[PDB]
Subunit: 266 residues, 3 copies
Amino acid sequence: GEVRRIKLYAERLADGQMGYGLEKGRATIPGPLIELNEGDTLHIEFENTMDVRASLHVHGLDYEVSSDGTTLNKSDVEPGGTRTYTWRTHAPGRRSDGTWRAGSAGYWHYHDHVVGTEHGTGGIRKGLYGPVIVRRKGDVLPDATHTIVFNDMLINNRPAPNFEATVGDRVEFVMITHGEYYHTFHMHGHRWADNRTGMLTGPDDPSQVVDNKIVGPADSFGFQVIAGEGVGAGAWMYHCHVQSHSDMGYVGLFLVKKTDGTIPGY
Amino acid sequence: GEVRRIKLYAERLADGQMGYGLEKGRATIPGPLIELNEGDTLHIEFENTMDVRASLHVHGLDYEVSSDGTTLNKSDVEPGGTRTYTWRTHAPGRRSDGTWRAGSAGYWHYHDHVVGTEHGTGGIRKGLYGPVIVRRKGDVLPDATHTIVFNDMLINNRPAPNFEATVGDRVEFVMITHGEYYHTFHMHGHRWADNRTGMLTGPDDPSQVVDNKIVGPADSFGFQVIAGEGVGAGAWMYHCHVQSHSDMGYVGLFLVKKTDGTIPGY
Amino acid sequence: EVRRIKLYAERLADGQMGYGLEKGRATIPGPLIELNEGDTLHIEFENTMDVRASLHVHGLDYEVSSDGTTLNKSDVEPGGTRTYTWRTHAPGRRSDGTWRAGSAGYWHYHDHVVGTEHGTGGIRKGLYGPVIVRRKGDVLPDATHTIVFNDMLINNRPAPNFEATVGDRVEFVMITHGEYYHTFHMHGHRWADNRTGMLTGPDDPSQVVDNKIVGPADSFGFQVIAGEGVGAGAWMYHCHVQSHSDMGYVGLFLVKKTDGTIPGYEP
Ligand SMILES: [Cu+2]
Ligand SMILES: [Cu+2]
Ligand SMILES: [Cu+2]
Ligand SMILES: [Cu+2]
Ligand SMILES: [Cu+2]
Ligand SMILES: [Cu+2]
Ligand SMILES: [Cu+2]
Ligand SMILES: [Cu+2]
Ligand SMILES: [Cu+2]
Ligand SMILES: [Cu+2]
């Protein structure tokens, strides 16, 4: 386990948005991907560059109330303030009561808990969210990672995103939901296991294999697929499968190229 | 596996409905049950008998973009048109790199993707949906299979269905959700495993045992029960457990008869 | 093995409705019923109210005569009495070579006839409670706390906190009722998405979560080591649906140090 240190900034963005960045003027929505191995400690030197209180709160990871990011625990950040947040992670192991301590590993996320309301409704709506992956020793690592956030009726706060791969690429997706509504995440031409890694461990793994998954606010899951496995290259749509949501125009493509670089035209 | 051929028709029905059928004028809502073993290939000679564009799109199974059933992938069908769709399935197994490839097996479904909207909102509403089961080698086979579809506030597009069995029958249910709303599927007197087959693989399988399940649009799961196991013969209701949904009167019965043919009075 | 309890449905002073083990002792949620796989429980039920009321259970083995429905003539007339029978079974091998799933799990009981023939009125007013069925060898907790998301309410409280000490094995039963989906979230803690809410071992691939989508009549549960790797503190649990959490209904898992103290918080 390594001790890692990063800077993070909350900033107002154009069009009434808010985002996290690794550097001032570089905030994105979603925020930057944070990747740890079980046992790693992360110190986030967080600077609130905004005129409203804001925080950093994380799902899944080990933190003390001093890093809750809540009003309740006085661990949000005043306008223009700085605070060091600490996230820890642990490997699984056998407890002295004979049980198995679940590790930190999994698909997680971070978001604001104080903009607009004491639940971060305003900050989340405006873009203060980002993905976190914690890996277990011997986890299969991907060729690329893509984050898809269903935030209210938006995808990654975009106007009313595409991801490119080549056939055979090991492609990871992080899938985070925020806001008021339930959604169903669907990907054409691909499927995954409903389990920790989104991949079956082997023949003894009875997890359902799905291409559709109901998600609600602050749900996070992830998976890896082999791009075009058994289906070939093409424009592979992903969408919410709630009919009226899918009808609002937000057509995302998983663009899987043949080895020569072509996609069967669309 | 085997190479199978079938014919499928989309037809308009009474009350502005649309159904799939294996023969002209035998369209049903839900559509016909398609059952495959992992490794089997299915060629569907699909005839759109209607006066609007229609398609056939499947979840879970292997298909090329030419069988996507979408306008994006030029694989919908003109009015009066014919198109051969091809569905493939695979068995699980280790890849070259030692990772486990999940099989096709599971509870799946097909539906229209181009009637009313480019997401099949009209076609789905009007009844262009059916079940698909892909079995693994050694899977327990049932005495009967019943399909229950929560389509918006309807069950199988019926106005505001019952299924008969004898005590000890192995009864399979396929549970598909479509449209706008989340639901909770509940069955009295019976329970199942929250996993691929709906049955525990044995004593190592940690899957939750449930009688109630949250489902969203395009969710599919299924399970087998022994009819009346440890509870006896009776009128065993299944219903959505969302209180306003269940109070609308959409409440079917799982009618489990004694071997003599009687049921306790209801 | 064969067990009996008394249960009463009561209109509460405030117009809510609850189950109790004794007259004028009704709670919302109702009393925790705990059974071992194989156990039979006879519930001598008395509806003390001026409206028909029932007892219906998820997950456990019961005949249609204990359905607690109008359809199966097993609701109770005002002032009436009825013995409901709940059976349970261990898992085992059927002759057909298949594995019969046992009764064990996080379950619940609720009214099926107050207001409507689906208990919409009873559930709304507080006629719900938790049932735990344990398998032989299941790990037992220092305490059990029941959290019910009932429409927009938690345990029908006005617009609940649970106290533990660091290292306590604390069990939560999480039931949902009514009209809306929700997402249950607990700060500082996580559990397995499986039967027990606890990973069996390194061979259990179950997702480890701190946030779960739940709909009406869903039940799950889990055990945590209070404050494990995170320390003493006021650990909030809440719905993560943003308009739901903003309504003010937020409970605290108050994890105290062994000297009875807690880091300062501002509720
Ligand atoms: Cu929170
Ligand atoms: Cu959606
Ligand atoms: Cu959160
Ligand atoms: Cu689609
Ligand atoms: Cu419903
Ligand atoms: Cu679909
Ligand atoms: Cu019911
Ligand atoms: Cu301790
Ligand atoms: Cu809620
Ligand atoms: Cu119920």
